[PDB]
Design a protein around this ligand. Structure first.
Ligand SMILES: Nc1nc2c(ncn2[C@H]2C[C@H](O)[C@@H](COP(=O)(O)OP(=O)(O)OP(=O)(O)O)O2)c(=O)[nH]1
Ligand SMILES: [Ca+2]
Ligand SMILES: [Ca+2]
Ligand SMILES: [Ca+2]
Length: 341
DNA sequence: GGGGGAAGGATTCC
DNA sequence: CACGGAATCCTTCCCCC
């Protein structure tokens, strides 16, 4: 089995660049302005010119300007990036039917029944990078190996604008020398939990007693890490289907006042319903980011679809249920619709 | 003992 | 200061064969 993984470079910023080539070369930071104050917000992402100086995704815009006061700060435009992604995903289908669209900017292609080895795969990769650059003008990174996880790491290592082949031999080197925290799915919190067990490489998970591992990071993670370490991990390329759609917005100021929170919640419901596109959800969740940046939610599943009118009415009750069970002030509020009909 | 679902929380960035 | 979207997993609670 041969898996090919494509991941677009600094995608959002790169898109802003394609839509305005004069940006090429300058540091570009795509931002999400909350509207709390002049420059309040966070960095969506930034091109490498800016990333080399510490401006990455997540930090406050304000902190970005303290580092690169003269970089180009553009507001984030999801819709556009969304349509640019789609177009690219379509070129990929022109290489395989078995394709899993993992996110807005990466996909796994099953090319096992279309190539005979890795040198011929390395070739199909260069082919794809070129077809994407020529058509949409976007540079991507390609990762190639036996399963999805290893293909992603290959990419992770070749970024940016690269292509790497992690073959069966190297898979052996990696399971030994690979830093466990560099494995897709191991975040800082799962990364630290594994330290307390003295696990620094995939191989270490083999020598610890399952029930202990299983009781430190949960059954799923554990079996996942083990199969990888044992070289017997091999999940298939699945055609993913959206199971959720929603929107969360930030308010001008924290509050626990129902009437001054509703407007944000209703707008979230409107943009939400517009994106459903013919789809009818049976479950709705009201999500709230409290003041100490802690997330809370309250949902309801219906035996039928939810009309926009029932959405408005029901979300208000769930918000009320939130302000009643939680004493904290609310910073961000939104809605999420699921269990589509 | 345990299927199956729903709900609220936790974690990754896949 | 610290935005935003969505998948997957964990745990407790329920209902009940
Ligand atoms: N709003 C927001 N968007 C994010 C965040 N992180 C990632 N994104 C979006 C914008 C990125 O362009 C897009 C693709 O994410 P990637 O992890 O692949 O990062 P990117 O492609 O930007 O750089 P990369 O070449 O992969 O190192 O995901 C975030 O924290 N907030
Ligand atoms: Ca990317
Ligand atoms: Ca990506
Ligand atoms: Ca990591």
């Amino acid at each position: 089995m041969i898996v090919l993984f494509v991941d677009f470079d600094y995608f959002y910023a790169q898109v802003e660049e394609v839509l305005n080539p004069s940006l090429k070369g300058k540091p570009v930071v795509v931002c999400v302005f909350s509207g709390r104050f002049e420059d309040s917000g966070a960095v969506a992402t930034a091109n490498y010119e800016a990333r080399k100086f510490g401006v990455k995704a997540g930090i406050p815009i304000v902190e970005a300007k303290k580092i690169l006061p003269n970089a180009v700060y553009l507001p984030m435009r999801k819709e556009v990036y969304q349509q640019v992604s789609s177009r690219i995903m379509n070129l990929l289908r022109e290489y395989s039917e078995k394709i899993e669209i993992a996110s807005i900017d990466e996909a796994y292609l099953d090319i096992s029944d279309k190539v005979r080895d890795y040198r011929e795969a390395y070739n199909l990769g260069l082919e794809i990078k070129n077809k994407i650059l020529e058509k949409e003008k976007i540079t991507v990174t390609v990762g190639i190996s036996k399963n999805k996880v290893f293909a992603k790491i290959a990419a992770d290592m070749a970024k940016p604008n690269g292509i790497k082949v992690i073959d069966d031999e190297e898979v052996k080197r990696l399971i030994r020398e690979l830093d466990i925290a560099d494995v897709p799915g191991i975040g800082n919190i799962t990364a630290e939990k594994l330290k307390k067990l003295g696990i620094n490489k995939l191989v270490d998970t083999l020598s610890i007693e399952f029930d202990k591992l299983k009781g430190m990071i949960g059954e799923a993670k554990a079996k996942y890490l083990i199969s990888l370490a044992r070289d017997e991990y091999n999940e298939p390329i699945r055609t993913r289907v959206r199971k959720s759609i929603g929107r969360i917005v930030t308010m001008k100021r924290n509050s626990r006042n129902l009437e001054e929170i509703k407007p944000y919640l209703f707008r979230a419901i409107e943009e939400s319903y517009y994106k459903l596109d013919k789809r009818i959800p049976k479950a709705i969740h009201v999500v709230a980011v409290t003041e100490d940046l802690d997330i809370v939610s309250r949902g309801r599943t219906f035996p039928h679809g939810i009309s926009k009118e029932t959405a408005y009415s029901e979300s208000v009750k769930l918000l009320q249920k939130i302000l009643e069970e939680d004493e904290r002030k609310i910073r961000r509020i939104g809605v999420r619709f699921s269990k589509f009909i």
